[PDB]
Design an enzyme around this catalytic site. Structure first.
Site, PDB file in Angstrom:
ATOM      1  N   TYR A 264       0.749  -1.244   0.000  1.00 44.60           N
ATOM      2  CA  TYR A 264       0.000   0.000   0.000  1.00 44.60           C
ATOM      3  C   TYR A 264       0.785   1.303   0.000  1.00 44.60           C
ATOM      4  O   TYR A 264       0.227   2.345  -0.330  1.00 44.60           O
ATOM      5  CB  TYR A 264      -0.988  -0.021   1.172  1.00 44.60           C
ATOM      6  CG  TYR A 264      -2.172  -0.920   0.899  1.00 44.60           C
ATOM      7  CD1 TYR A 264      -3.279  -0.441   0.205  1.00 44.60           C
ATOM      8  CD2 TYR A 264      -2.147  -2.273   1.253  1.00 44.60           C
ATOM      9  CE1 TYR A 264      -4.333  -1.280  -0.142  1.00 44.60           C
ATOM     10  CE2 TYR A 264      -3.203  -3.127   0.907  1.00 44.60           C
ATOM     11  CZ  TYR A 264      -4.289  -2.616   0.206  1.00 44.60           C
ATOM     12  OH  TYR A 264      -5.325  -3.435  -0.175  1.00 44.60           O
TER      13      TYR A 264
ATOM     14  N   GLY B 126       2.399   3.740  -1.660  1.00 43.95           N
ATOM     15  CA  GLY B 126       2.544   4.120  -3.052  1.00 43.95           C
ATOM     16  C   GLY B 126       1.111   4.310  -3.511  1.00 43.95           C
ATOM     17  O   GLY B 126       0.202   4.230  -2.687  1.00 43.95           O
TER      18      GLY B 126
ATOM     19  N   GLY C  82      -2.584   3.588  -4.866  1.00 39.90           N
ATOM     20  CA  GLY C  82      -3.469   2.441  -4.854  1.00 39.90           C
ATOM     21  C   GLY C  82      -2.968   1.365  -3.911  1.00 39.90           C
ATOM     22  O   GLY C  82      -2.331   1.652  -2.892  1.00 39.90           O
TER      23      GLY C  82
ATOM     24  N   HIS D 281      -3.914   4.998   5.878  1.00 37.80           N
ATOM     25  CA  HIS D 281      -3.890   6.346   5.323  1.00 37.80           C
ATOM     26  C   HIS D 281      -4.794   6.362   4.087  1.00 37.80           C
ATOM     27  O   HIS D 281      -5.564   7.302   3.884  1.00 37.80           O
ATOM     28  CB  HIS D 281      -2.453   6.732   4.954  1.00 37.80           C
ATOM     29  CG  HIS D 281      -2.315   8.126   4.427  1.00 37.80           C
ATOM     30  ND1 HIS D 281      -2.149   8.401   3.087  1.00 37.80           N
ATOM     31  CD2 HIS D 281      -2.313   9.323   5.061  1.00 37.80           C
ATOM     32  CE1 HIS D 281      -2.045   9.707   2.919  1.00 37.80           C
ATOM     33  NE2 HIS D 281      -2.141  10.290   4.100  1.00 37.80           N
ATOM     34  N   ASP D 282      -4.702   5.313   3.272  1.00 40.05           N
ATOM     35  CA  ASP D 282      -5.534   5.191   2.075  1.00 40.05           C
ATOM     36  C   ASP D 282      -7.013   5.173   2.471  1.00 40.05           C
ATOM     37  O   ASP D 282      -7.845   5.827   1.842  1.00 40.05           O
ATOM     38  CB  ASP D 282      -5.216   3.893   1.319  1.00 40.05           C
ATOM     39  CG  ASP D 282      -3.925   3.965   0.528  1.00 40.05           C
ATOM     40  OD1 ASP D 282      -3.207   4.987   0.617  1.00 40.05           O
ATOM     41  OD2 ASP D 282      -3.625   2.985  -0.191  1.00 40.05           O
TER      42      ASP D 282
ATOM     43  N   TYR E 232      -8.253   8.564   3.476  1.00 38.73           N
ATOM     44  CA  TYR E 232      -8.538   9.401   2.315  1.00 38.73           C
ATOM     45  C   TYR E 232      -9.854   8.964   1.675  1.00 38.73           C
ATOM     46  O   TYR E 232     -10.617   9.797   1.182  1.00 38.73           O
ATOM     47  CB  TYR E 232      -7.400   9.302   1.293  1.00 38.73           C
ATOM     48  CG  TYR E 232      -6.305  10.335   1.474  1.00 38.73           C
ATOM     49  CD1 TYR E 232      -6.008  10.865   2.733  1.00 38.73           C
ATOM     50  CD2 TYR E 232      -5.554  10.769   0.384  1.00 38.73           C
ATOM     51  CE1 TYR E 232      -4.984  11.808   2.894  1.00 38.73           C
ATOM     52  CE2 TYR E 232      -4.531  11.705   0.535  1.00 38.73           C
ATOM     53  CZ  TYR E 232      -4.252  12.219   1.786  1.00 38.73           C
ATOM     54  OH  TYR E 232      -3.240  13.141   1.915  1.00 38.73           O
TER      55      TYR E 232
ATOM     56  N   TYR F 148      -3.416  22.201   2.836  1.00 40.10           N
ATOM     57  CA  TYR F 148      -3.918  22.630   4.133  1.00 40.10           C
ATOM     58  C   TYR F 148      -2.798  23.401   4.817  1.00 40.10           C
ATOM     59  O   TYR F 148      -1.779  23.700   4.199  1.00 40.10           O
ATOM     60  CB  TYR F 148      -4.313  21.405   4.978  1.00 40.10           C
ATOM     61  CG  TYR F 148      -3.262  20.311   5.019  1.00 40.10           C
ATOM     62  CD1 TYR F 148      -2.015  20.529   5.612  1.00 40.10           C
ATOM     63  CD2 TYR F 148      -3.502  19.068   4.434  1.00 40.10           C
ATOM     64  CE1 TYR F 148      -1.029  19.534   5.616  1.00 40.10           C
ATOM     65  CE2 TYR F 148      -2.522  18.065   4.431  1.00 40.10           C
ATOM     66  CZ  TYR F 148      -1.292  18.306   5.021  1.00 40.10           C
ATOM     67  OH  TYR F 148      -0.322  17.323   5.001  1.00 40.10           O
TER      68      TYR F 148
ATOM     69  N   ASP G  17      -2.933  12.695   7.225  1.00 38.13           N
ATOM     70  CA  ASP G  17      -1.501  12.824   6.980  1.00 38.13           C
ATOM     71  C   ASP G  17      -0.689  12.767   8.268  1.00 38.13           C
ATOM     72  O   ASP G  17       0.317  12.053   8.352  1.00 38.13           O
ATOM     73  CB  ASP G  17      -1.211  14.142   6.255  1.00 38.13           C
ATOM     74  CG  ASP G  17      -1.582  14.097   4.784  1.00 38.13           C
ATOM     75  OD1 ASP G  17      -2.229  13.112   4.359  1.00 38.13           O
ATOM     76  OD2 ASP G  17      -1.224  15.048   4.055  1.00 38.13           O
TER      77      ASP G  17
HETATM   78  C1  LIG Z   1       8.998   6.844   6.609  1.00 36.25           C
HETATM   79  C2  LIG Z   1       9.144   5.493   5.842  1.00 36.25           C
HETATM   80  C3  LIG Z   1      10.589   4.967   6.296  1.00 36.25           C
HETATM   81  C4  LIG Z   1      12.015   5.272   5.627  1.00 36.25           C
HETATM   82  C5  LIG Z   1      13.241   4.686   6.170  1.00 36.25           C
HETATM   83  O1  LIG Z   1      14.228   4.550   5.226  1.00 36.25           O
HETATM   84  N1  LIG Z   1      13.384   4.330   7.391  1.00 36.25           N
HETATM   85  C6  LIG Z   1      14.627   3.728   7.959  1.00 36.25           C
HETATM   86  C7  LIG Z   1      14.628   3.552   9.438  1.00 36.25           C
HETATM   87  O2  LIG Z   1      13.750   2.814   9.951  1.00 36.25           O
HETATM   88  O3  LIG Z   1      15.502   4.142  10.132  1.00 36.25           O
HETATM   89  C8  LIG Z   1       9.000   5.349   4.173  1.00 36.25           C
HETATM   90  C9  LIG Z   1       9.146   3.833   3.527  1.00 36.25           C
HETATM   91  C10 LIG Z   1       8.365   3.893   2.095  1.00 36.25           C
HETATM   92  C11 LIG Z   1       7.871   5.417   2.094  1.00 36.25           C
HETATM   93  C12 LIG Z   1       6.501   5.708   1.190  1.00 36.25           C
HETATM   94  C13 LIG Z   1       6.787   5.318  -0.370  1.00 36.25           C
HETATM   95  O4  LIG Z   1       8.052   5.989  -0.777  1.00 36.25           O
HETATM   96  C14 LIG Z   1       5.514   5.594  -1.300  1.00 36.25           C
HETATM   97  C15 LIG Z   1       4.979   7.127  -1.204  1.00 36.25           C
HETATM   98  C16 LIG Z   1       6.039   8.209  -1.785  1.00 36.25           C
HETATM   99  C17 LIG Z   1       5.492   9.696  -1.631  1.00 36.25           C
HETATM  100  O5  LIG Z   1       6.488  10.602  -2.148  1.00 36.25           O
HETATM  101  C18 LIG Z   1       5.199  10.064  -0.130  1.00 36.25           C
HETATM  102  C19 LIG Z   1       4.087   9.043   0.424  1.00 36.25           C
HETATM  103  C20 LIG Z   1       4.625   7.516   0.381  1.00 36.25           C
HETATM  104  C21 LIG Z   1       3.316   6.713   0.917  1.00 36.25           C
HETATM  105  C22 LIG Z   1       6.027   7.301   1.296  1.00 36.25           C
HETATM  106  C23 LIG Z   1       5.774   7.666   2.926  1.00 36.25           C
HETATM  107  C24 LIG Z   1       7.181   7.400   3.630  1.00 36.25           C
HETATM  108  O6  LIG Z   1       8.237   8.259   3.037  1.00 36.25           O
HETATM  109  C25 LIG Z   1       7.639   5.752   3.597  1.00 36.25           C
HETATM  110  C26 LIG Z   1       6.306   4.975   4.329  1.00 36.25           C
HETATM  111 CA   LIG Z   2      -1.525   3.307  -1.227  1.00 40.33          CA
HETATM  112 CA   LIG Z   3      -6.766  23.837   0.251  1.00 42.51          CA
END
Ligand SMILES: C[C@H](CCC(=O)NCC(=O)O)[C@H]1CC[C@H]2[C@@H]3[C@H](O)C[C@@H]4C[C@H](O)CC[C@]4(C)[C@H]3C[C@H](O)[C@]12C
Ligand SMILES: [Ca+2]
Ligand SMILES: [Ca+2]
Length: 124
Positions: free
Chosen positions: A28, A30, A32, A48-49, A52, A73, A99
């Site tokens: 999830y 990413g 969808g 989170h999905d 939304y 926001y 968020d």
């Molecule tokens: C905060 C975490 C952890 C990163 C990490 O490297 N931790 C090492 C540690 O545990 O120390 C990352 C892993 C995958 C990321 C998601 C993916 O990149 C997919 C997508 C990318 C978007 O730019 C922002 C929303 C999000 C849902 C991202 C939210 C967030 O950016 C995530 C959910």
């Molecule tokens: Ca998703």
């Molecule tokens: Ca707005």
């Protein structure tokens, strides 16, 4: 908005890496998603999905191209703490809180590298 969500994540997790944005995680994290989340971090993204999805279901809320990620926001960061501005309108407040809770959720969940860019067609 999506860019603000990324900002919130940096707020709660200063050490997070920018390049990660090119990647997806679990089933999830990413756009969808499908099946069931593979771990706690992935669960955060699914919730989170769902959050939304709930926002979109509010008859009082309409988003550009029906995408809540476009909804900007107001929020502030202070010592890794996230605060959603009370002045956000009801729709914006809902999104901001989705968020915020997700960012907090991410900050406490373990990160399993094996789940980065997972073969979703096979494991989701
Ligand atoms: C905060 C975490 C952890 C990163 C990490 O490297 N931790 C090492 C540690 O545990 O120390 C990352 C892993 C995958 C990321 C998601 C993916 O990149 C997919 C997508 C990318 C978007 O730019 C922002 C929303 C999000 C849902 C991202 C939210 C967030 O950016 C995530 C959910
Ligand atoms: Ca998703
Ligand atoms: Ca707005």
């Amino acid at each position: 908005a999506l860019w603000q969500f990324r900002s919130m994540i940096k707020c709660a997790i200063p050490g997070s890496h920018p390049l990660m944005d090119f990647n997806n995680y679990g089933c999830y994290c990413g756009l969808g998603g499908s099946g069931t989340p593979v771990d706690e971090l992935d669960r955060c993204c699914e919730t989170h999905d769902n959050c939304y999805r709930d926002a979109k279901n509010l008859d009082s809320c309409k988003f550009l191209v029906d995408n809540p990620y476009t909804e900007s926001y107001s929020y502030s960061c202070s010592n890794t703490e996230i605060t959603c501005n009370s002045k956000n309108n009801a729709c914006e407040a809902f999104i901001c809180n989705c968020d915020r809770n997700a960012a907090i959720c991410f900050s406490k969940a373990p990160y399993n590298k094996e789940h980065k860019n997972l073969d979703t067609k096979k494991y989701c």
